[PDB]
């Protein structure tokens, strides 16, 4: 689902910026050589998401969390909600 | 049915909620607000001050001591003494 | 208050307009008698104006 | 948004459109603008091409918060996405809305 | 009677003597929070003594949810060394305990309309605004919330003595409540 | 579906006589009609079934806190119903284990108040084995009562008491 | 024991189901989420064991068939405009900071051709917008924004791409375009039905041509009773028989090439004394 | 009058038209009457029989209700409308015998068991318990 | 212990099922009542006797008491009671509703299953049971097969045996999810089957108020059970106190437990079956008295059976995902509309799909 | 300020209405008035007489088509319930609407939780709660003279 997700937002970035290399004048190889260079690449755990609710009782933190990609153990994973508990 | 108990009227909550979110209105540092008050000057040439307060989105009285530092207000027999963005 | 009013004094329209207020539309009904309480309800008024 | 331009899918897209400048075929102008559209197709799609929920539970070591932007870090946590564990000894959560 | 209140907050303010710069300490310190769309000061957490202290642009901290007076001038003094470390000027000057919230249970229902039937001139109890009566005891400037379950919260007090003197004198009037 | 109604009314017809003997018991059954409660066109399942239903609501009533006399009345509405089936396999009644101790010391009292009907009628289900010695009544998935006070005061009590004052 | 008929009742009042207990028995009280997949589940799934919520299939309902429709639309409405719109905000960001007039004036004029493609594009009819029923939408979000989560994406992929695309005939079969199915099938053998589906002309799935094909066969069942077939029906009803209840739906699944209204005429009309 | 005038005067007035830019919308439809109420001190409504209005000096008066649709427009193609059924508008005096009065369609005998003498004719008005009569 | 409701009407304490045999049993020693033989002048004096022994009456007064109390179809009622008046209406408003009034399939069903085996006597007589083996009446719940079996949830009741080990109800339970064959069959649909999951994953266990009764009895069986103690003794979950066993070690008769409570039967990795002990009776002389067959199935749920989308002839034997041929996307084919659909002349899959075999539920179960 | 001093008129004169019955018909929120009411007692060194639950009958009953029987009723029951203890330090109004349900339930005209909620000003929850307190004392609480179409034996 995560090199799905992610062959999508190439796809989609690619497909929309297609418009502006045409327009200041740069050839589409360069767009094409721009996709598979991204798609080539492609190839600390952080989780970069929106908070939805940080609720947060005496001491027990609940996270509402929503759309997200994490990096845990070097493998990149995607949530569109996340709901988690804490104990500080 | 009628006046029937209501723990809050929906329109007053409506309200409320959204005055505390818009929360608060900061003082940007002069300099950034000298910066807007000139470049809306090209627009026309004069301003009122509730008008302007909505421009640059800052304390009428905070606003007011920096058009005072710099800006003065004519009197004119049309409308009513309004402020002038032209320090001459 | 405004039909009220109107009704318990007699004057027509508001009541900060009594200037131009029509008086003596409304009247405590006479209950003298039978007869004068019936020919109170079917009372006819002419104003002059 | 400058948020998601951290992850490897942002810092592959950097170092695209770093490697495509330095080789003098493409502006920083359109670079630029290219990076703002990823941020844009990229809030798109984590929100309408993504639907799974995981669930973690961890012990929450320090917190922060300013300019609209939560800094969670937490020790020993367990996410739990839809069937699988994945326990991780320590996780920063950079959250902002 | 024997029972006493148990002190459960302590607020108290100190002035760090020196203006300061929150968005640095919200960028640095370890636990704290800064929303200034929300309220105007730097909102620290710590754990060893517990206690949650807000810290002002001008200066002026105040530390709250401690249990014990000294435990509060301990947490003060540790936000104090926690601005120091963050390269500011920061004292402890003027450290004053202003408020304890001490609670208690006499352990035995108590029948709060007769109690604000003989105290009126004392008691508030508005059931549809607050299930419990609001005893303002005038002797020490104290403020009980007292339950019809005999939990009764005292409240406003600078000192522990305030406490415990508002208390011995509410006990023999709920005494004489005894539901 | 009305089976209860018709509990209740032989129940009733039985306790105004005042007796506990079987032939009393015996007449109203005749008259009554009520062993063809379970004629008529059905099918095995619904049959058995509307028996189930029978046999444990008649049971229900042999069990307190009900009266004496609508306890061996529904004793031996219990027998009329087991004995007079459409069923093959007879349904069987259903005893849990806790009324177990009581429907034997009832048994105790039937003998001892010589009251042989009722008591041969028990026997008589025992032999033909009729019980399912359950754990619970009423697979679990997911009136005439008695009252404390007699059983606190009563004539004798009051007799007693007055003799010792 | 009349106190503790009142606590009984109490508790009663206090008591509370069996939804709970399904399919993930255990669950925190926290999260509500079971327990890890065993060893053997992950196994399982990776000898690709359909789970049974997998094999759940539902019938597509005729608002779900619109809701498709209108939704493919949109996304490719929002697909065609997003670059255009992107370089019309591009054009505009270029002239707020062009230092310069006559680029300005050309800026301008390249920012009215981009109006006029957007305005073409927003005036495309509905024919041309929906595609060639081979062309990638975004449907990992119609399964997401549209249906709200009620079918995947590959299920609305194939349902759009192979039945509910306007480019599949779904107008009733004609005598003529039957014969021409059975004659082409008989001919072109009835093993390539895509090249069956081409070949017949009319704008059909391959999936509809082998349907109508089945629908009206005649090899289909075998039509015909042989001894060896009665004694495997008679095995086979006396090893699924409960009593008089015989399963005959149960029974075909082992007979070749019958179904279960000749197993019932049979077992019937031919195998009991009766 | 109370049956045609009133509501065709509520029908005939123009709908208000209010721009803040929100756009807000009253529109009044239909107009409903009780039969003549008093409330006491705690508030509980009660018939008010034409002889206690006399005798404890009120104004024999009917309340009355319109049924009022609003509808916001935000500029944001969605618009709310909201009815409030029946909505209290005030209270109309009551012309005695009328068909919106108490005693209406009672027996003579109904009206001596109120206190109310059966050749009375009606065709006034009780107003702070005094009987107006509206001369033509 | 004595079973006794914890809920109103709804379950029951935790009590050992041995120690309530034992009571029964006991309560019972030795007073005729657990016969299990069949029922059987001269024996008129005998039984008059034997009242007179158990009443204390003479044996005239037995001989009264026999003659009164004996025993006092025709499709016919007249002179109706309030329930027989019901079922008068309801016989003649089916009467005149109903055209050919016979019992539908389904009656037929749930009869021929609950009364397949009563009275069928053992055939060996060393396969009888023993006076008194308290046959437990459990009813395990159907996997969610199909959607709406969330809603209301389809069971199978098993009569299982007191005093008859576990893993004797755990081979017995049916369940498909022991037929499925792994692996996909897009390439060639000819292959050898793959082992059935009946063989490959044999772990499995029961948990009963707090322990998991693991079925440890082959090599090829792991700790499911594992997974689930780790996973709680991790963050408190609400669970606590979680034990183990080994299931071949135990009986239902060494068992302590509710009834009508929910308990867990999980195998083939995540299939999970709800088990439900609906009650405990002591085995009578009418049911069936082997132990050959008798965790024995009382009831099924006859699910529907699933048929080729192609022609509705023949059930689904196939499974195929990502079909370029395939209108819905999990498309069910029989063999014949497979084979004719995705393979040439000899084998070489047409297009891109993945096969997978299917058993049908509806049919295996 | 006037909404707050409406309201203490109102409990002055012995009448009172609720907070839910001011803010009903101000245009500020129930924290206001009670803010303001609080305010003005401490300003005016005033106080008013505690509320009891046979207060809000006579207007509750009659906003609600209830007999005058049933309120009676409702005002014995819930008399008695505030004097035997059954609602402890629960506010008089809750009371008040759930010996109204009681009372109505009852009698023969019915009335569900949700129309007293509405009239009472009370979550219906909160019914419930107060409810479930004076649920096994009912009989003992209604008037001995009772006529009723339902047996006060049987109620949900
Ligand atoms: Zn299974
Ligand atoms: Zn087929």
Same mark, same amino acid.
């Given at each position: ?88 | ?82 402020? &002038?963005?032209?320090?001459? | ?49 | ?97 | ?46 754990? %060893? ?131 | ?21 079987? #032939? ?134 009051? #007799? ?6 | ?124 009819? &509905?024919?041309?917008?929906? *595609? ?30 192979? +039945? #509910? ?33 081409? #070949? ?27 001894? &060896? ?44 004394? *009766? | ?136 | ?7 109103? %009407? ?24 657990? +016969? ?173 108020? *707090? ?155 | ?156």
């Amino acid at each position: 689902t995560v090199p799905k997700l992610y062959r999508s937002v190439i796809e989609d970035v690619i497909n929309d910026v297609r418009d502006i290399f045409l327009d200041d004048g740069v050839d589409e190889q360069v767009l094409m050589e721009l996709k598979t260079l991204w798609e080539n690449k492609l190839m600390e755990n952080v989780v970069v998401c929106q908070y939805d609710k940080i609720h947060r009782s005496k001491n027990k933190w609940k996270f509402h969390l929503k759309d997200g990609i994490m990096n845990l153990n070097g493998r990149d994973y995607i949530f569109s909600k996340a709901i988690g508990d804490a104990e500080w | 049915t009628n006046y029937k108990p209501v723990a809050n009227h929906q329109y007053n909550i409506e309200y409320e909620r959204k005055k505390k979110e818009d929360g608060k209105r900061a003082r940007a540092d002069k300099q950034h607000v000298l910066d807007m008050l000139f470049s809306a000057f090209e627009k026309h040439q004069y301003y009122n001050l509730k008008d302007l307060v909505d421009i640059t989105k800052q304390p009428v009285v905070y606003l007011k001591e920096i058009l005072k530092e710099i800006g003065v207000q004519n009197v004119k027999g049309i409308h009513k003494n309004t402020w &002038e963005l032209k320090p001459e | 208050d405004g039909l009220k009013y109107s009704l318990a004094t007699g004057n027509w329209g508001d009541q900060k307009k009594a200037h131009q207020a029509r008086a003596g539309v409304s009247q405590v009904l006479n209950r003298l008698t039978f007869a004068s309480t019936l020919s109170h309800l079917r009372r006819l008024n002419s104003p002059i104006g | 948004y400058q948020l998601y331009r951290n992850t490897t899918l942002g810092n592959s897209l950097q170092e695209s459109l770093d490697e495509l400048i330095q080789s003098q075929q493409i502006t920083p102008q359109l670079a630029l603008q290219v990076l703002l559209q990823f941020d844009k197709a990229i809030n798109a799609a984590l929100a309408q091409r993504v639907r799974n929920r995981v669930n973690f539970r961890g012990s929450l070591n320090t917190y922060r918060f300013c300019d609209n932007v939560w800094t969670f870090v937490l020790n020993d946590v367990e996410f739990r996405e839809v069937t699988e564990l994945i326990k991780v000894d320590k996780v920063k959560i950079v959250a902002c809305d | 009677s024997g029972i006493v209140p148990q002190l459960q907050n302590i607020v108290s303010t100190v002035n760090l003597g020196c203006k300061l710069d929150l968005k640095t300490i919200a960028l640095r310190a370890r636990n704290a929070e800064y929303n200034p769309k929300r309220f105007a000061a730097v909102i620290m957490r710590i754990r %060893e003594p517990r206690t949650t202290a807000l810290i002002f642009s001008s200066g002026k901290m105040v530390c709250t949810g401690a249990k014990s007076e000294e435990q509060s001038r301990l947490a003060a003094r540790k936000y104090a060394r926690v601005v120091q470390k963050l390269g500011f000027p920061a004292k402890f000057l003027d450290f004053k305990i202003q408020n304890m919230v001490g609670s208690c249970d006499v352990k035995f229902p108590i029948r709060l309309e007769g109690l604000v039937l003989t105290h009126q001139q004392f008691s508030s109890y508005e059931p549809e605004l607050f299930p419990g009566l609001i005893y303002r005891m005038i002797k020490p400037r104290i403020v009980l919330l007292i339950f019809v379950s005999g939990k009764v919260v005292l409240t406003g007090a600078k000192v522990r003595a305030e406490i415990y003197e508002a208390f011995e004198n509410i006990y023999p009037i709920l005494k004489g409540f005894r539901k | 579906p009305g089976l209860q109604t018709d509990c209740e009314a032989l129940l009733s017809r039985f306790q105004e006589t005042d007796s506990v003997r079987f #032939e009393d018991f015996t007449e109203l059954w005749r008259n009554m009609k009520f062993g063809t409660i379970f004629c008529g066109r059905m099918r095995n399942l619904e049959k058995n079934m509307f028996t189930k239903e029978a046999l444990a609501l008649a049971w229900r009533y042999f069990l307190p806190p009900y009266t004496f006399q609508i306890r061996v009345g529904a004793l031996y509405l219990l027998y009329g119903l087991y004995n007079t089936q459409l069923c093959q396999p007879k349904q069987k009644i259903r005893v849990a284990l806790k009324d177990w101790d009581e429907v034997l010391k009832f048994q105790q009292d039937l003998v001892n108040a010589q009251h042989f009907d009722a008591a041969y009628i028990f026997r008589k289900l025992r032999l033909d084995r009729a019980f399912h010695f359950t754990a619970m009544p009423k697979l679990l998935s997911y009136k005439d009562p008695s009252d404390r006070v007699m059983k606190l005061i009563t004539s004798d009590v009051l #007799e007693e008491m007055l003799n010792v004052h | 024991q009349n106190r503790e008929q009142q606590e009984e009742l109490m508790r009663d009042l206090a008591g509370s189901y069996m939804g709970h207990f399904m399919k993930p028995y255990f669950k925190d009280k926290v999260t509500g989420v079971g327990p890890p997949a065993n060893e053997d589940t992950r196994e399982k799934a990776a000898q690709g064991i359909k789970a049974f919520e997998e094999l759940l299939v539902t019938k597509w309902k005729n608002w779900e068939k619109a809701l498709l429709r209108k939704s493919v639309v949109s996304d490719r409405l929002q697909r065609l405009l997003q670059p255009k719109l992107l370089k019309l905000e591009y054009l505009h960001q270029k002239q707020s900071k062009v230092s310069s007039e006559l680029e300005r004036q050309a800026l301008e004029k390249q920012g009215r051709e981009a109006e006029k493609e957007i305005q073409d594009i927003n005036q495309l009819p &509905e024919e041309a917008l929906l *595609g060639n029923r081979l062309d990638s939408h975004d449907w990992e979000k119609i399964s997401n924004i549209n249906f709200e989560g009620s079918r995947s994406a590959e299920e609305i992929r194939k349902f759009w791409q192979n +039945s #509910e695309h306007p480019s599949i005939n779904k107008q009733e079969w004609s005598r003529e375009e039957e014969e021409r199915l059975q004659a082409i099938a008989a001919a072109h053998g009835h093993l390539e039905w895509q090249k069956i589906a081409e #070949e017949l002309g009319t704008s059909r799935s391959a999936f509809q041509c082998l349907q109508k094909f089945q629908q009206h066969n005649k090899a289909l069942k075998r039509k015909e009773w042989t001894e &060896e077939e009665d004694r495997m029906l008679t095995q086979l009803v006396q090893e699924m028989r409960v009593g008089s209840h015989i399963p005959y739906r149960r029974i075909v699944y082992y007979m070749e090439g019958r179904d279960s209204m000749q197993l019932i005429y049979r077992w019937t009309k031919s195998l009991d004394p *009766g | 009058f109370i049956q045609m005038s009133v509501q065709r005067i509520v029908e005939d007035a123009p709908p208000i038209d209010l721009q803040a830019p929100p756009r807000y919308l009253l529109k009044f439809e239909q107009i409903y009457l009780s039969k003549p109420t008093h409330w006491e001190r705690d508030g509980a409504p009660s018939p008010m029989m034409p002889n206690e209005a006399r005798l404890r000096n009120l104004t024999y008066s009917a309340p009355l209700y319109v049924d009022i649709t609003k509808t916001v427009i935000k500029e944001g193609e969605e618009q709310l409308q909201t009815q409030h059924q029946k909505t209290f508008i005030g209270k109309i005096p009551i012309m005695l015998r009328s068909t919106y009065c108490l005693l209406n369609g009672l027996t003579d005998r109904d009206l001596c068991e109120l206190n109310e003498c059966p050749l009375d004719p009606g065709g006034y008005f009780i107003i702070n318990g005094s009987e107006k009569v509206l001369i033509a | 212990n004595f079973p006794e409701y914890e809920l109103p %009407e709804l379950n029951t304490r935790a009590f050992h099922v041995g120690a309530f045999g034992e009571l029964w049993r006991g309560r019972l020693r030795g007073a005729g009542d657990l +016969s299990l033989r069949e029922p059987p002048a001269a024996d008129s004096d005998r039984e008059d006797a034997a009242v007179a022994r158990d009443l204390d009456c003479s044996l005239e007064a037995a001989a009264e008491l026999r003659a009164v109390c004996g025993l006092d179809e025709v499709i016919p009622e007249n002179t109706d009671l309030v329930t027989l008046g019901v079922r008068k209406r309801f016989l003649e408003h089916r009467e005149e509703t109903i055209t050919i009034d016979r019992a539908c399939r389904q009656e037929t069903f749930v009869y021929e299953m609950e009364s397949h085996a009563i009275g069928k006597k053992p055939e060996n007589s060393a396969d009888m049971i023993e006076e008194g083996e308290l046959i437990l009446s459990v009813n395990i719940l159907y996997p969610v097969i199909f959607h709406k079996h969330k809603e209301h949830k389809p069971y199978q009741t098993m009569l299982v045996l007191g005093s008859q080990k576990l893993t004797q109800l755990r081979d017995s339970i049916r369940c498909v999810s022991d037929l499925q064959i792994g692996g996909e069959f897009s390439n060639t649909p000819d292959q050898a089957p793959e082992h059935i999951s009946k063989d490959l994953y044999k772990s499995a266990f029961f948990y009963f108020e *707090g322990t998991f009764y693991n079925d440890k009895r082959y090599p090829e069986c792991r700790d499911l059970s594992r997974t689930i103690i780790e996973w709680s003794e991790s963050h408190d979950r609400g669970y606590g106190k979680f034990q183990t066993a080994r299931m071949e070690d135990f009986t239902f008769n060494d068992l302590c437990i509710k009834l009508g409570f929910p308990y867990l039967y999980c195998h083939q990795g995540d299939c999970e079956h709800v088990i439900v002990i609906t009650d405990i009776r002591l085995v009578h002389h009418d049911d069936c008295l082997d132990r050959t067959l008798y965790p024995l199935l009382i009831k099924k749920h006859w699910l529907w059976t699933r048929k080729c989308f192609v022609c509705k002839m023949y059930t689904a034997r196939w499974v195929t995902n990502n079909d370029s041929f395939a209108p819905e996307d999990p498309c069910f084919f029989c063999d014949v509309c497979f084979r004719m659909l995705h393979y040439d002349s000899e084998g070489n899959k047409l297009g891109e799909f993945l096969a997978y075999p299917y058993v049908d539920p509806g049919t295996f179960n | 300020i006037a909404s707050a001093c409406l309201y203490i008129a109102c409990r002055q004169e012995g009448v009172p209405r609720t907070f839910k019955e001011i803010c009903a018909v101000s245009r500020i929120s129930k924290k206001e008035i009670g803010r303001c009411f609080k305010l003005i007692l401490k300003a005016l060194e005033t106080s008013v007489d505690l509320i009891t639950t046979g207060d809000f009958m006579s207007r509750f009953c009659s906003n609600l088509c209830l007999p005058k029987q049933v309120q009676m009723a409702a005002t014995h029951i819930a008399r008695k319930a505030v004097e035997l203890d059954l609602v402890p330090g629960r506010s008089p109004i809750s009371v008040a609407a759930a010996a109204i349900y009681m009372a109505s339930q009852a009698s023969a005209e019915k009335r569900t939780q949700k129309e007293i909620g509405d009239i009472a000003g009370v979550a219906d929850v909160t019914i419930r709660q107060s409810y479930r307190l004076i649920y096994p004392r009912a009989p003992d609480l209604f008037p001995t003279d009772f006529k009723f179409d339902t047996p006060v034996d049987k109620l949900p």
